[PDB]
Amino acid sequence: GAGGALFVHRDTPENNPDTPFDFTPENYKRIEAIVKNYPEGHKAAAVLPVLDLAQRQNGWLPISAMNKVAEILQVPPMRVYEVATFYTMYNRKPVGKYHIQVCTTTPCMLRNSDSILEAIQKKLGIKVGETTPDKLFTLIEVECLGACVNAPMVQINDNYYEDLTPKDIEEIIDELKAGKIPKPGPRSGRFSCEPAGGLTSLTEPPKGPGFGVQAGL
Amino acid sequence: APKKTSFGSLKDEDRIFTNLYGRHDWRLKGAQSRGDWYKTKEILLKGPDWILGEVKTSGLRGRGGAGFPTGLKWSFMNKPSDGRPKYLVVNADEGEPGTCKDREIIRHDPHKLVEGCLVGGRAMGARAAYIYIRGEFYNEASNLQVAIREAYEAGLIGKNACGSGYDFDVFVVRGAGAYICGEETALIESIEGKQGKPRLKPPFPADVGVFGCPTTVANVETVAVSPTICRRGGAWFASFGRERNSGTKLFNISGHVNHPCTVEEEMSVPLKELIEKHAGGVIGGWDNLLAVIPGGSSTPLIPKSVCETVLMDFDALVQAQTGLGTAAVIVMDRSTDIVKAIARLIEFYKHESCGQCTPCREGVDWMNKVMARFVKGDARPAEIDSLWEISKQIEGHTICALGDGAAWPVQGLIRHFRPELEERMQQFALQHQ
Amino acid sequence: WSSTADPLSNLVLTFSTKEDAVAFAEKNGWSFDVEERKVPKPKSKSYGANFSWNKRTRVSTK
Ligand SMILES: NC(=O)C1=CN([C@@H]2O[C@H](COP(=O)(O)OP(=O)(O)OC[C@H]3O[C@@H](n4cnc5c(N)ncnc54)[C@H](O)[C@@H]3O)[C@@H](O)[C@H]2O)C=CC1
Ligand SMILES: Cc1cc2nc3c(=O)[nH]c(=O)nc-3n(C[C@H](O)[C@H](O)[C@H](O)COP(=O)(O)O)c2cc1C
Ligand code: SF4
Ligand code: FES
């Protein structure tokens, strides 16, 4: 589908260069640590980590934060604009407290991700582009979060919830809005990508060090 | 009896990723108990030439999906230094639909990846290793960071790595939601704080790479098997699989199977054996199977008549007008709308294009619109050949292989299910008068 | 409208070489000015220079 969000910034009272943003001293220490991970003369390599840290501190990315990152890294603001508008994990508009991302790619689609999307829709009463009136949940559609084996799966604030049934995701939503912390992972009684059939492989105890080592080493 | 003709049924002791399911301690102590970091100092002291020779004898091909010979590719960094530093880049972006192996390698066997990074960096003379992992894998990246900290404290990496006298650093760099950033040149751009747009080759990363320095980009699975290959030797790895298809492989089986899972199996195992052995078989029985995408969304699908006798290696699947890819098996039964699935894949490719070059940027969106119309049946039969020609134009005329990965599924669908498209068009024409 | 009184305002001749034009002008008795042909100089293009380790040729965007 066509991307709803625009790629031109128009100043608003909520979002304009005079919007107050700054990094906390702990965040400045983290920025120093991040910058020391690249060779001298290549400070611009830290644009993505520092921008992500700004988003993690603020929740989203106002243009003031992007200008601040450009100023800290001595990078022209247009390059930071390019980075922020290229990568989809950056939020250039405010999002809810829990950003719900449902994978609808073909491997997840085959395992009825439509049921999960509809269950979330009828539990929250919002669409796949809206935010709840209490500003708690934002629901969007994403592409292949990397857990195709555990389809259908959903990501909520860098946490994975997979092997989902509509009732399971509704319960997760209830305990999320109740202030609890839901345990990330599959909900079907399997811990990880192992087969649910009974662990067809890797049954024997793992071999000790140097077991298969060749001679002359 | 030399020259094996039947492949598969791999034993546990021959497996490399002995903690694929996270059933053991992923920390340093568990990895050491499982054979990791064992006389790796002796491996480093053997010199880059010995490691490169072992990798070449192993016959390892790139596990990222292209199947390039790992030894020949790594030998490109065996040049004398010209004043610039040398770097190793580990590709952990893992963008293909259907692929889940690198996530498990990172989350459950991180010390394997760290030791492979050290061994490969010593082999190619790299000063440090940058691990580029997708930003969706936050817990996986934090586990990797914990493992790297454990290795640093134990003296396994850093100054005087493992007592070998070779200095090596391991860095973790997180991207922000970009499937194109898995391509090696696009990944290099993403590391340097720029847009994830691929670079034209030449120059190759061995000449001009990250920060303009000689660089090698290698998949997580390719890196994580090198220490075990060097420990047991090239010959042991070589025996498994067909000739030029050596070693073990990680397989992700999803879609319409009873037990979708990630399993480790020998290379040339037949697809039917793998599906009925580890995945629990096709939902509704084997006779209910309609089509299989063997190597992730970039590889063309094959119908049931091909899946019952095909082998899961590069050459066999190439002979089947498809590719091994990332060994990501997606299974669809006869209840599946085959056109809708390919349309969803094309939508994925339309949303993942970086837009740098004309053929991908416009043609992929054009094919997305055409296939969206195809799903409803609004088009005409000549548009099938039109779409085939459009795909041909996109293929081989783009900067990177994302255009290839968008074109190939369309070609496979047109090749194997043209009557379905024609029938849907005829139904639309009837119903809409 | 735009008016003119010189009959030669639209006359343009094409020649394969400078000497042919000079000879035509001389035999027709016209005073001429000749300007030497300008050719763009050959240039050193290198795609790898966009990504230099230490030089200023490194690009900030693509
Ligand atoms: N694991 C994953 O998440 C994904 C994997 N893929 C796979 O990636 C494949 C295409 O990737 P490409 O890099 O475009 O294939 P490629 O053949 O062009 O390159 C593969 C590796 O070999 C090197 N290489 C190739 N030719 C070389 C040469 N003549 N000289 C020196 N080095 C050379 C390349 O630098 C690269 O590192 C696809 O077949 C796809 O299956 C695609 C998307 C995602
Ligand atoms: C669009 C695109 C995306 C890719 N994404 C990945 C990826 O996420 N992970 C990966 O290992 N390789 C990916 N690749 C293939 C890389 O080129 C490959 O991993 C790299 O050359 C490493 O080579 P190797 O297989 O010898 O390790 C991608 C290729 C393309 C064209
Ligand atoms: S083929 Fe697509 S993704 Fe690759 S460089 Fe061209 S526009 Fe970008
Ligand atoms: S298809 Fe859902 S995680 Fe990839």
Report d(CA B364, CA B361) in Å as an integer. Answer: 6
Report d(CA B292, CA B312) in Å as an integer. Answer: 12
SS (H, E, C) B13-39: CCCCCCCCCCCCCCCHHHHHHCCCCCC
* Method for this entry: cryo-EM
User: Is C60's CB within 8 Å of A41's CB?
Assistant: no
Please indicate, yes or no, whether residues B362 and B385 belong to a single structural domain of this protein: yes
Q: Compute the distance from residue B350 Cα to the ligand 1 centre, in Å.
A: 20
SS3 content of chain B, % helix, strand, coil (to 5): 45, 15, 40
- Angle value at C-alpha B100, between B201 and B74, nearest 5 degrees: 35
Q: Which residues of B touch A144 (CB under 8 A)?
A: 95-97, 179, 348
* Alpha-carbon dihedral sign for residues B88, B93, B96, B100: positive
Has domain A98-186 been given CATH number 2.30.110.10? no
Q: Residue type for B27, please? A: R
Please indicate, yes or no, whether residues B260 and B273 belong to a single structural domain of this protein: yes
Give resolution, Å, one decimal.
Answer: 2.5
**B287 to A43, A147, B256, B260: CA distances (angstroms):** 58, 27, 13, 18
Q: Where in A76-207 does DSSP place strands (E)? A: 98-103, 137-142, 154-156, 160-162, 185-186
Q: Is A87 exposed, middle or buried (0-12, 13-18, 19+ CB in 10 A)?
A: buried
Peptide bond into A184 cis (omega under 30): no
CB count, 10 Å around CB of A115? Answer: 14
Report d(CA B267, CA B14) in Å as an integer. Answer: 13
User: Is A44's CB within 8 Å of C54's CB?
Assistant: no
Q: Residue type for A177, please? A: K
Nearest Cβ partner of A194 from B46, B261, B344? Answer: B261
List of long-range contacts for A167-174, beta carbons under 8 Å, 24+ apart? A167/A119, A169/A116, A169/A119, A169/A120, A169/A123, A170/A119, A170/A120, A170/A123, A173/A120, A173/A123, A173/A124, A173/A137
State both tokens at A55.
């988003």
Domain of B294, in residue numbers: 248-333
Helix (H) or strand (E) holding A72: helix A63-73
Please indicate, yes or no, whether residues B316 and B361 belong to a single structural domain of this protein: no
In short, whether A110's Cβ falls inside 6 Å of ligand 4 is no
Please indicate, yes or no, whether residues B324 and B365 belong to a single structural domain of this protein: no
Q: Compute the distance from residue B70 Cα to the ligand 1 centre, in Å.
A: 11
Of C55, A70, A72, A42, the C-alpha closest to B210 is A42
Write the class of the CATH domain A25-86: mainly alpha
Please report, for the domain that includes residue B301, its CATH number.
Answer: 3.10.20.600
State both tokens at B20.
């694929």
Burial B222-250 (b: 16+ CB within 10 A, else e): bbbbbbbbbbbbbebbbebbbeebbbbbb
Is there a common fold for A25-86 and A98-186?
no
Report d(CA C49, CA B408) in Å as an integer. Answer: 33
Report d(CA B328, CA B299) in Å as an integer. Answer: 10
Report d(CA B218, CA B116) in Å as an integer. Answer: 11
Residue B254, phi then psi, degrees to nearest 5: -135, 180
Please indicate, yes or no, whether residues B302 and B381 belong to a single structural domain of this protein: no
Please say whether the beta carbons of B97 and B259 come within 8 A: no
Report d(CA C52, CA C57) in Å as an integer. Answer: 7
Of B400, B119, B72, B83, the C-alpha closest to B213 is B83
Please indicate, yes or no, whether residues B385 and B329 belong to a single structural domain of this protein: no
Report d(CA B60, CA B274) in Å as an integer. Answer: 21
Breaks in chain A, after residue numbers (C to N greater than 2.5 Å): none
Using CB distances shorter than 6 Å, the residues near ligand 2 are B 62-66, 68, 70, 73, 91, 93-95, 180, 182-184, 217-219, 222, 400-402
Beta strands B169-174 and B128-133, pairing class: parallel
Which residue's structure tokens are 């800290």?
A72
Report d(CA B230, CA A58) in Å as an integer. Answer: 47
CB count, 10 Å around CB of B3? Answer: 6
Residue B208, phi then psi, degrees to nearest 5: -135, 115
Please say whether the beta carbons of B406 and B296 come within 8 A: no
Report d(CA B174, CA B191) in Å as an integer. Answer: 9
CB count, 10 Å around CB of B220? Answer: 28
The DSSP bridge partners found for residue A193 are: none
Which DSSP category does B211 fall into? G
